[PDB]
K(+)/H(+) antiporter subunit KhtT
Amino acid sequence: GSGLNIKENDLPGIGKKFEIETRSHEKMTIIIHDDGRREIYRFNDRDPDELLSNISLDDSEARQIAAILGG
Amino acid sequence: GLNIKENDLPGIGKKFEIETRSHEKMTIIIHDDGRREIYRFNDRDPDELLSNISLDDSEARQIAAILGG
C-alpha cells in the first residue's frame, strides 16, 4: 500500500537487486553489480512487463547522482 | 563523459541536468519543501519524456543510500 517498500534480493555471484515501490505508487528496480555497475529500471506503474526506461551507471557516476539525490 | 549542470529555480528549488557516460540523460528537481522529481529523456530527443518519478525527502535519501552504497 502506502509507505516506502524496498525488497532486496541477492543475485548469487552477480550482485544485489532492490525492488522499490514509492509512496506515489511508482516502481523502480536497482541492480548493484559486484563490479561497480548500477542499473536502474523503471516500469509501468501498473504493468511490470513494460519497461519505461533504463540507465546504466558506473560506480563513480552512481555516487555522484546519489549525492545530488540525497540531501 | 559525466556532465552535470546546476541551476537555481528562484523561490522553488534547484535543477540538475545530468548527462552520463552511457550518453543517457536525466533531470532532477530538488524542491525547497524537500520533494524530488526525476525526469528521464530520450538520448537524442529532449522533448520526449521516457519516465518520471516523484520522491519525498525521506525516500530520496533512502534511494540515494542504495545507489551510492
User: Anything to note?
Assistant: Chain B touches chain A through 32 residues (CB under 8 Å). The first helix of chain B runs from residue 57 to 68.
